[PDB]
Design a protein around this ligand. Sequence first.
Ligand SMILES: CC(C)S[C@@H]1O[C@H](CO)[C@H](O)[C@H](O)[C@H]1O
Ligand SMILES: CC(C)S[C@@H]1O[C@H](CO)[C@H](O)[C@H](O)[C@H]1O
Ligand SMILES: [Mg+2]
Ligand SMILES: [Mg+2]
Ligand SMILES: [Mg+2]
Ligand code: NA
Ligand code: NA
Ligand code: NA
Ligand code: NA
Ligand code: NA
Lengths: 1011, 210
Amino acid sequence: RRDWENPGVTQLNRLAAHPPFASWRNSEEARTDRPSQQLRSLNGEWRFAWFPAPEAVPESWLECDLPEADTVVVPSNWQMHGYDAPIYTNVTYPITVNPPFVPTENPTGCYSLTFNVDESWLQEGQTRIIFDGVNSAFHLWCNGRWVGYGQDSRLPSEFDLSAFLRAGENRLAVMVLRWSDGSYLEDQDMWRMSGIFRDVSLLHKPTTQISDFHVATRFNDDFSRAVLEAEVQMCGELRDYLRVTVSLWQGETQVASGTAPFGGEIIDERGGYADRVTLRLNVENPKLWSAEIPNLYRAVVELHTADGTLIEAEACDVGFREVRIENGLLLLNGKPLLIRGVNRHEHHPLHGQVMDEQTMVQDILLMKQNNFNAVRCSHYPNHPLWYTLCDRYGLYVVDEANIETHGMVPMNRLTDDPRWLPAMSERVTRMVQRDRNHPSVIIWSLGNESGHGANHDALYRWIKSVDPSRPVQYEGGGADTTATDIICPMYARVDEDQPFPAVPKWSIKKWLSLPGETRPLILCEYAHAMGNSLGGFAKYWQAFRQYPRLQGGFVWDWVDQSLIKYDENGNPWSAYGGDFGDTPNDAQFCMNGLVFADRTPHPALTEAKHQQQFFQFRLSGQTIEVTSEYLFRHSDNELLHWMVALDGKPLASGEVPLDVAPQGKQLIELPELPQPESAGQLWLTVRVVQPNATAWSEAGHISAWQQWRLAENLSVTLPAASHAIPHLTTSEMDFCIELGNKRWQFNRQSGFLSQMWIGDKKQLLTPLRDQFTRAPLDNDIGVSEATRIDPNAWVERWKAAGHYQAEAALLQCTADTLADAVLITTAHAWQHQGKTLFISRKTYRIDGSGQMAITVDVEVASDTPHPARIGLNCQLAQVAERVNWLGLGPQENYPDRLTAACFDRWDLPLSDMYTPYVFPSENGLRCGTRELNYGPHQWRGDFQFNISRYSQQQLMETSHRHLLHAEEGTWLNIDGFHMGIGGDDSWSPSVSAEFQLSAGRYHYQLVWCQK
Amino acid sequence: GHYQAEAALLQCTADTLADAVLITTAHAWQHQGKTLFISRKTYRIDGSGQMAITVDVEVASDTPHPARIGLNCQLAQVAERVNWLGLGPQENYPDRLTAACFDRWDLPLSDMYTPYVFPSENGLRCGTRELNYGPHQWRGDFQFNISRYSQQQLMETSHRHLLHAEEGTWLNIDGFHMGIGGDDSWSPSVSAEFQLSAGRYHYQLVWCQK
Ligand SMILES: CC(C)S[C@@H]1O[C@H](CO)[C@H](O)[C@H](O)[C@H]1O
Ligand SMILES: CC(C)S[C@@H]1O[C@H](CO)[C@H](O)[C@H](O)[C@H]1O
Ligand SMILES: [Mg+2]
Ligand SMILES: [Mg+2]
Ligand SMILES: [Mg+2]
Ligand code: NA
Ligand code: NA
Ligand code: NA
Ligand code: NA
Ligand code: NA
């Protein structure tokens, strides 16, 4: 039959989907959500054997363990065990596009387990086996007999084993196929793996059982009253003494209850459902659920008898909240939401796509700690525990169907084909049946990147009909089709339109007001955080706050999908596409996260946290105005700390408790600030601290901050005149200046400062030269490949123009002896094929105080692509432990990504000045710096800089961070100006005009001295 | 105190280079003990008779952004024509220069003055690389206006018919000029991108003979 090559067969003998069941036989255990003896986990050590195709599987395997098989842990992805290689491809399918066929060589994983079952389970009741996740299709055997078949790698497949089990030992035989017709609907941009990657368990329910139950909550106008309606369905023989009781609990307090016999209301001419009943409980002044305050109740569903005998009990956490779109706004409990979300794949560097509680909790804590309040399940239903945690910790969830056909041409070839409607319907309907009772889920998504087809419209309506409590969204086909209640574009820019044919990405502000449009707009994906990115993130949030209908979005994405590999020495390293022999592949495009695979934060995370703050501030005179963006909670665990400092030097500070109602405002009058003596700029820094710990944060957690420049007193005091005078020495090859034990040498042939001496020790390993390029960021590269060059990408434009090839040509180099100093004047021209790209004119003034003032004026040809930077660089012989600077920090920050950084005195170890992006590139820059200190060196001015043991050349020539090696001394890159990093997307130029170095003429000055 | 600011000399030195004389100066503008602006310049005069002027200005971040950052002087010369290579031919400002075109323009001096009934700063031309007037030529990248009326007379006269040509020609050469605004005329309307808020400014000019 080859059921894995037929979209018409997505399962055989599979049981109906339903909400989380545990079949408790004790009401109190159900109420407390404690373990159930009727729900057994089969996770642990199983027997596994890999085969190149289903036809290679020996028939004996059904009856007994294969002596060649290994004992492995389940759940797991067999690629993580090394049986075959994981494949990383973005859009292009990992297999030949020829629906519904798959490769004849179909990696097959044969799992098996010998287990025993409780005696009583064999004599009464129903015993089913549940596979929460099998990638991507499989056949099931029990004690040699065929049981069933199942598809869809992201939802549980259940089968009844009652007629197969026997006393003593039993044996399961699971043949998992890597490829199947289901693969055509699972083309998500992630590693392609396979196996039994989610829990496996046995559930024992009575013959007369609760087969399904739905919880709904409706409210009155001001949410002071609510009605909980619970529909309960049963299977088995109906008896007049049967009853169903639904009790609602708030802690150990029962707040409401309803009991009734089966027999629903009349629905049509043939009657009603005799096997169903709906209980309605009134709840006065319910505690409402939200991400701000995840108030939850406990609903216990008891199937019992009229005289008081319990047959079975199920239960779920209940969150009282209303989600609806009114007048173009998405409202949660009547208030317009502002989605601070992120897309999150289920990925672990060591375990692949197998999820665990520890990792899930870690992500949620980090997310809330960084001001995120929502998550999108990109791009499939998640491990069941995830929804539980979101319900309890408080995160708005977008539950998404496991449907992506990105690789088709056109993208909707399958989704507009009725032949594929059945397969698609199961991926949507079974998701709803499983998660419809989770309050954290507030929006349903029909899938991802599958164009727009009629099947989408059909399924959009199906959801609208069965569950009107949640809006339905889908981005495919233009982001505003008839299959979505929310305009949910991906990477639509703030002000810039991208008029693509048929599926344009309009500026988000413009999109909202297109003729006839009235829907809210929430980006399903934006700010592609690939490598050194998130430039321009602040632009989105400013728009979100100004426009009511722009209600946020989900950053792409949470964590780098890098995998761990080990070198010959057994040392681990982060690997990406192609590092497993997998080909074709899409290399580093699997790493687009705000945090590294091991959950270590990328510098971009702090920018997201800052822009996503829940408190806004304004300063006027001595008054600070705090505005709350919370919709439901009061600032009941917030303290405001304020600090005033003169160029890093703290002068005054204090703290005030925040007492702001949601959407409210609080005025804080700062005490009189005593005018500082010294000259300089006074800076005000405010930060909101949470004194008490929470379920997701430690005491002292900082949730928001902001800075303002206060009074500034320009220095008019002239420096103390020195007695000594620098002495100029000349030769045919160099200009040397001497002052005390210091010496500066300028090469007359190159026109650069080639050496400096402090006593007899050389200070430079490489001359101080202008630099106009940078080791290309992923955003600079885009999708440009050696075999497939994208002439439009910034890196290709710089290459074609000769920016990396340009050679400095000396035009002038002279020395003059002034009254109290020596003046070196130079001028260089950088050309490529007879074209002058840049011209640099400088003057170096070395005075009797030992300070060298460097003045730089650069000309950039208006027709050459704007340069990545305009500065100087050199390799210092010095290798110090610390880096101290007065400027923006402490973390890496760039022109279009520096709002989170604060101006102050920062001091960190040299290693912290380097950001370990898996794919090496320009990194570690810090902007708005007025003073830099390293070893005996001090540089002053107003510049940007990065300092490390890796040169731009090495970073630019190394594909993985583990292959980098510290060079001799330290490489210093001091820029007068630096280009934005961009990031609206990473496959097209995304650096906004205001951050491009297009002025044509640039000026900057530096003062180099010994401290 | 921008209109009252007094220039205080901080430094004035002279050096003799191999092929030129270098003059260095520094001034502080203050009002009631507050330093509003600091101007540091160098004047380099070579054998070609050209005077290269470099200007680097500091503006206190807490003082309201200044209307302009430039130089001015009253020339003894009164010429009939004004010739420049920059945006024109009509008056244009930073936030109102899209209509102007870059080219070689030559107009009678009177056309370099816009007769607004209520006198004010007027006649500026932006993005100018070369300006010619009489025996003078200024080169660089600046904005400028030139007329027989000082900024002082313009702001002290309520009607254009009461203006009187002063001796010589007043020249205002700006490295930078603030936008004029206009979204309305009863509240500040100059957009942020056209306000001089950089804190530190640099511009250079070359004064020589045409
Ligand atoms: C190849 C791009 C033009 S499509 C682009 O690739 C990205 C890779 O991180 C993400 O998967 C986006 O969702 C997808 O639209
Ligand atoms: C600092 C808050 C956002 S944590 C927030 O406070 C709420 C009370 O206002 C509830 O205690 C929530 O459970 C808690 O997560
Ligand atoms: Mg099939
Ligand atoms: Mg895709
Ligand atoms: Mg700020
Ligand atoms: Na909004
Ligand atoms: Na990706
Ligand atoms: Na508080
Ligand atoms: Na690289
Ligand atoms: Na006037």
